[PDB]
Symmetry: C3
């Protein structure tokens, strides 16, 4: 039967990893997105930011694909993002997908914007 | 009551700032997008491109989130984009949100593609 | 009469060009996406990856806009993408749009993620 898709745009802080905003396209109670972990490399030149998305839709199985980009007021810093953890499989109800990003150290104030492309069905 | 979302993909010229195309996903009369300003830095190494989006939907209040990327036939130029003006707040009817981008000088022909993620309600 | 939009996220391999996954947002039989060509530059420092999208929707004419990004577990490589072939025009039934990308040589395992923004009508 029923099939649904949603796009959720998450703004997170590049220094603490904290989530600043969860912005739903067309869904707020259907998913829970949370910081799992934010660790510096011992060099301090990179940052590892790890997030989880939990399917909270009773009845539904979900797929999740992602895109992420650094949002910054400067233009001189490296903004490549390395993908680490990435759950490409089905995500049952109350199961989580984990999405990890390796980012270069950013200037103060820089943000990580993560786009979750959700495809769910019963 | 009613709630709506739209994605609008705008192609603008990196040298003049002029808008080449307003491409609506699922909306053409609901919004007006326009160049406000295009200024070189006195160094001439960067470009400041500023756009406005006006809510034209009678009854509706809107949120707007953005993504932008340089579209270019080369691969050797810096394509980092610095975010400047960015209206994250509610946008009432006939109110505008202003979105400003700091870009590096690009080779001839390069374009700025701006994605507007619109979430409107009554 | 009727009007429709779809987003299709394609994962392709940066070394062979092969398509790993066609991920439809809200469509699987409406379009066919295929590798046309993958060629090294004789320098071997760049890669030219060319794809076709065929409209398979009986009755429909389509527009297609694209976004592409390198998905990689590292952060040290150039990930600029040069746009080459790009069909901006109408695409009739069983007509194809061709989309070509110039990418820098990537580390093993790196992927090209192409986003097709489809707007179709009768």
């Amino acid at each position: 039967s029923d099939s649904k898709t949603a796009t959720v745009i998450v703004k997170a802080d590049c220094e603490t990893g904290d989530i600043d905003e969860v912005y739903n396209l067309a869904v707020a109670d259907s998913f829970h997105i949370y910081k799992i972990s934010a660790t510096d490399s011992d060099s301090g030149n990179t940052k590892k930011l790890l997030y989880g998305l939990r399917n909270k839709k009773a009845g539904y199985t979900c797929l999740c694909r992602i895109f992420a980009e650094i949002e910054s007021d400067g233009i001189m810093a490296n903004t490549n993002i390395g993908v680490a953890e990435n759950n490409r499989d089905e995500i049952d109800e109350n199961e989580e997908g984990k999405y990890g990003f390796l980012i270069p150290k950013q200037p103060a104030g820089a943000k990580l914007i993560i786009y979750f492309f959700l495809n769910c069905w019963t």
